[PDB]
Amino acid sequence: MPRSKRSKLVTLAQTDKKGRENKERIFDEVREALDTYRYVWVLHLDDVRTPVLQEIRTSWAGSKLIMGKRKVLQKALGEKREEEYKENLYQLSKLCSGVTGLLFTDEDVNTVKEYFKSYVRSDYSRPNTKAPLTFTIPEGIVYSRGGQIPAEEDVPMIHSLEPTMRNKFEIPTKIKAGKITIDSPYLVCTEGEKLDVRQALILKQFGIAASEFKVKVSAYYDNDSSTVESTNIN
Amino acid sequence: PQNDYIERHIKQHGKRLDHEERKRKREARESHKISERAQKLTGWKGKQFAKKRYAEKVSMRKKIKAHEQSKVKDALPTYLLDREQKFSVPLPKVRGISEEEMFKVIKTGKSRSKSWKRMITKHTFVGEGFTRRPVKMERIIRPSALRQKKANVTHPELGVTVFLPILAVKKNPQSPMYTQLGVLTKGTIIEVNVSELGMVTAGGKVVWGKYAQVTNEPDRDGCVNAVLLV
Amino acid sequence: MKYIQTEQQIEVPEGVTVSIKSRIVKVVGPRGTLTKNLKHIDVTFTKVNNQLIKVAVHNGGRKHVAALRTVKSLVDNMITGVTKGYKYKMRYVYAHFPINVNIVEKDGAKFIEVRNFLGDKKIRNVPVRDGVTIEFSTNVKDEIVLSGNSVEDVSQNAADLQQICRVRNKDIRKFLDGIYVSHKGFITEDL
Amino acid sequence: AHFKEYQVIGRRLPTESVPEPKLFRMRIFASNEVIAKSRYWYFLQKLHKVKKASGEIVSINQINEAHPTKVKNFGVWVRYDSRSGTHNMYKEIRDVSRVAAVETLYQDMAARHRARFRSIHILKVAEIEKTADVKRQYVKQFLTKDLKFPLPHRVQKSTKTFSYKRPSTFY
RNA sequence: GCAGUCAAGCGUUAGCGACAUUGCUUUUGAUUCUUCGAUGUCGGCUCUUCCUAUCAUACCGAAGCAGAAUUCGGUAAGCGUUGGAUUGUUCACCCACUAAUAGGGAGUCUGGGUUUAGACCGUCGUGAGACAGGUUAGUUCCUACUGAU
RNA sequence: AGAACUGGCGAUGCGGGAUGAACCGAACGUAGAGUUAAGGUGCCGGAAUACACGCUCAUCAGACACACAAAAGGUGUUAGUUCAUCUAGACAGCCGGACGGUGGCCAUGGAAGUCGGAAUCCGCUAAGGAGUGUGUAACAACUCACCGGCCGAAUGAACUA
């Protein structure tokens, strides 16, 4: 297959791939941190906002946490008994179902669990989850916030996003003289309904982040006791 | 009339539904269309298409190289900065222009049997002292259209060409009778008024004339090129 | 490189059952019946399970291998149409002249009729292809709905209906009257 | 062609006071002993200059296939100069015997690269005994477990100029 | 073109060299009033035939194309491409009307002229003699197609 | 252009090259038998529509005094060289992150990264460009440079015939 193969759309940018060097650095960091701190915790961060993660890091900067590829992190912790860096460390790795998010610290379990339980932040719909609340787009002139606000002050939607609504959000709409308008109100969400990608994108565009994401933890590891307790918070 | 409003109308009707989709489909089909045309565009068109493609590829390569180099990271006075910038002749053993049709024969008289006339088909410089003699004496004829007074002059220094009057011709090889005739005959050495450059030899005696050799062939070109023998 | 064996797997739901002799393919399901001819393609079908069907090419080339991956796609599309059903929506918008659309019963063929397009007096007619039912998109301002079993027939009908409203010798940027496909989907909604 | 394997050796005829010089042995495939000897001298005059007058063939012996019944893969390295100059090339061929593999390689080279017998120089041929040695799909394709495939569009030559049965593919 | 410049590649592998690139290449829509020895017979009438490197009509396409109308790439030879004008040479330019009044080859009735007619003015020579010009006088059924027995 | 040198025509029949006064072969009386050089073995044209390895889709390919419009180009085909990605999950496909000082500094009614322009920092990490683009009066709105959630076994880049 010399010719007619798939072409490329490479674009010039001031950034390059880190390559295997970053993976090796993460491996070494995980290995060092395993013995650096008495307590090791696993945090699931499949979908988390960058500012929230930065704020969490700053709150307990001393309680440094190392993140990376799930498979790479599992290899660093040791998936098998003969590969574990520490005795019975594979139990923590096995319970790591989500994306870690390996936290190393010294404070007792009570402090960590209280911090996890007492913290919660708003988040997008994140489809495959129950609808946080019902929402229907009002008719007439539309607004950037979806109309669930004092629309008398809200700025009308920009014309540039009308094609996005037609194609991306898949919401039938028409174009009017000055502002985007719809002939009839179109429902997009309802209580207890499993949302879809289109609904999530629409909610994110309207800024209705009625959902609330919270840190998820599955277990932790004790350096001395060499035992893993399947602590869970919901 | 009615300045750029068309943008306003586009903003009030917003990118007709099929326009974006059609544009995207055309852009996707652009590669296939170019590949197909690489086989189409037959004689007198495929050559131009290939030349354009080669130029585009060279430009893309040079732009990629510049980006890659950038991603890695003759003193002049304060008033000249930020401003635009073994005695063998350069061309020995010139082509041996033979004594041939170049001395074109023009038939004279109503009955063309006593021409006796020869015409020089080579560029020649004479100057003010031409003074065409009576027609009966025109044994050799140098046409006016083929006479040039200013020849291009250059030197491997600053690459500046300036048209200068031709002063005279001193030595034309290959039967210098041509020298006596004043013909250019590329390979000749001619004097040129170099007063424009104003180069001054040792002793403060400003020079304004130097001998230069014709580089280009004025017979096959409408311009005369020479290089200063400095 | 002249692959000795190449094939693909086709999943047939229990709601339909196909029969493949020499390459004329009949499809029967809850949404009616469909047929297609594939003799020209020169491929071979093979049954490995009651719900799975395989198509294989022996000692073929890239030009012939590509045929397999499109025959599989066509079979999948036919199965979905006979089971899921294909629905097409085509909205039309007019600036000044109110466009009128009606399904005239002339000659039985039921040609799609359009009038008052940009004020043009000439009547434009487009035949309704077999296997696709034309219906109006009630509750949707100025929109028509097309659906059926054959994807190709519906797509060709929509293409003809949108091309018949072409604008000539006019700036497309300023001229907006026409027929544009809204979106592509299925009759079910929510199957 | 139906080449044969000949063991060609040289001696660099002994100069005075230097009896029994170094002996060099070469494995080469040729249709006859004369061609094998000529190729031996051609390679000798390239690896280390020794002319025909200054050398001679110690002996020539035909090498028969050790096991001309086991089907095996063969790794072959090929070098040729056409149209461009010298450049290395590697190929993998599955055949019963080394001579058959060499013949198939020569035919494939002639078909694809238009190379000639003199333009092709045999470098090394190594037998394969286990998987993971072959690195190309077109050879690995035949190593699949229980490989099966029919012959499509089978046709048979007709002895008679005309047939009344309207012969069809069999099937 | 000349002399460089960057240097995709080949290099004895110090030199070459594709594409770009700098200097010739009245900065205030000013007016150059410029149009410089074509030594040759061709020039113009009608009709037919062939090409597209096509002017209109036809086809569709890209445009600050909003229309009118305009700039241009491409398909297309189907049908059209008219009329006056100089000569103190018509190696060519003007403007009536149209949608346009496209470019060539295959030469084929008429007029300059390509040639000895006879003469003249001046050139050149002691002269016959011929011209750097020029004017006058001029004479050049065999085969194939269309109808019929 | 010019020199010495070799062969044929010159003075020449014969087979083939559609035909060529310079090509390939070839030691010219009259006949018979058998084997060849050159050309071939679908018909004119006497001889396999012979075997075997592959290529060739060509809008007038290809069978062309081999001579140059000939250098590249084809998301056309067949075969090979080098460098990296790799089950510390190969390429490609669906989803999220794409931060914080910051709305950098001078230009100034607007340049919040995408009308001007100098460097392009430090804090920060799995990763973030004082920005690649689409589009806005002004951000805003969306994509990748780069990373992760699923997949699921070889992949991407430059060259040669």
From Swiss-Prot, chain A:
Organism superkingdom: Eukaryota
Segment forming the signal sequence: none
Sample GO molecular function, one term: large ribosomal subunit rRNA binding
Keywords: Cytoplasm, Nucleus, Ribosome biogenesis
InterPro entries: Mrt4, Ribosomal_uL10, Ribosomal_uL10-like_insert, Ribosomal_uL10-like_insert_sf, Ribosomal_uL10-like_sf, Ribosome_Assembly_uL10
Cell location: Nucleus, Nucleolus; Cytoplasm
Gene Ontology CC entries for this record: cytoplasm; nucleolus; nucleoplasm; nucleus; preribosome, large subunit precursor; small-subunit processome
UniProt xrefs under Pfam families: Ribosomal_L10, RL10P_insert
Function: Component of the ribosome assembly machinery. Nuclear paralog of the ribosomal protein P0, it binds pre-60S subunits at an early stage of assembly in the nucleolus, and is replaced by P0 in cytoplasmic pre-60S subunits and mature 80S ribosomes.
Subunit structure: Associates with the pre-60S ribosomal particle.
Family: Belongs to the universal ribosomal protein uL10 family.
Protein name in UniProt: Ribosome assembly factor MRT4
From Swiss-Prot, chain B:
Location of region: Disordered: 1-42, 60-76
Protein location: Nucleus, Nucleolus
Broad class of the protein's primary localization: nucleus
Residues covered by region (Interaction with RSA4): 74-85
Name of this protein: Ribosome biogenesis protein NSA2
Species: Saccharomyces cerevisiae (strain ATCC 204508 / S288c) (Baker's yeast)
Origin superkingdom: Eukaryota
Note: Present with 8660 molecules/cell in log phase SD medium.
Function of the molecule: Involved in the biogenesis of the 60S ribosomal subunit. May play a part in the quality control of pre-60S particles. Under normal, rapid growth conditions, high levels of NSA2 would allow the progression of pre-60S particles through the ITS2 processing.
Manganese among keywords: no
Curated annotation (Swiss-Prot), chain C:
Source species, domain of life: Eukaryota
Pfam families referenced in this protein's UniProt entry, alphabetically: Ribosomal_L6
Gene3D superfamilies membership: Ribosomal protein L6, alpha-beta domain (3.90.930.12)
Keywords: Cytoplasm, Ribonucleoprotein, Ribosomal protein
GO aspect biological process, one term: cytoplasmic translation
Main subcellular location of this protein, as a coarse class: cytoplasm
Entry's Gene Ontology molecular function annotations: rRNA binding; structural constituent of ribosome
SUPFAM superfamilies: Ribosomal protein L6
Protein name as catalogued: Large ribosomal subunit protein uL6A
UniProtKB/Swiss-Prot annotation, chain D:
Entry's Gene Ontology cellular component terms: cytosol; cytosolic large ribosomal subunit
Gene Ontology biological-process annotations: cytoplasmic translation
Pfam families to which the protein is assigned, alphabetical: Ribosomal_L18A (PF01775)
The UniProt record lists the keyword Repeat: no
InterPro entries to which the protein is assigned, alphabetical: Ribosomal_eL20, Ribosomal_eL20_dom, Ribosomal_eL20_eukaryotes
Cross-link Glycyl lysine isopeptide (Lys-Gly) (interchain with G-Cter in ubiquitin): residue positions: K124, K130, K148
Molecular function in Gene Ontology: structural constituent of ribosome
Main subcellular location of this protein, as a coarse class: cytoplasm
Localization, UniProt: Cytoplasm
Sites bearing Phosphoserine, chain numbering: S31
Keywords: Cytoplasm, Isopeptide bond, Phosphoprotein, Ribonucleoprotein, Ribosomal protein, Ubl conjugation
HAMAP family: Ribosomal_eL20
Family indicated by similarity: Belongs to the eukaryotic ribosomal protein eL20 family.
Self-association state and partner proteins as the record states: Component of the large ribosomal subunit (LSU). Mature yeast ribosomes consist of a small (40S) and a large (60S) subunit. The 40S small subunit contains 1 molecule of ribosomal RNA (18S rRNA) and 33 different proteins (encoded by 57 genes). The large 60S subunit contains 3 rRNA molecules (25S, 5.8S and 5S rRNA) and 46 different proteins (encoded by 81 genes). eL20 forms multiple interactions with RNA and proteins in the central protuberance, connecting components of core functional centers that are located far apart.
Additional comment: Present with 54300 molecules/cell in log phase SD medium. There are 2 genes for eL20 in yeast.
Name under which the protein is recorded: Large ribosomal subunit protein eL20A
Gene label: RPL20A
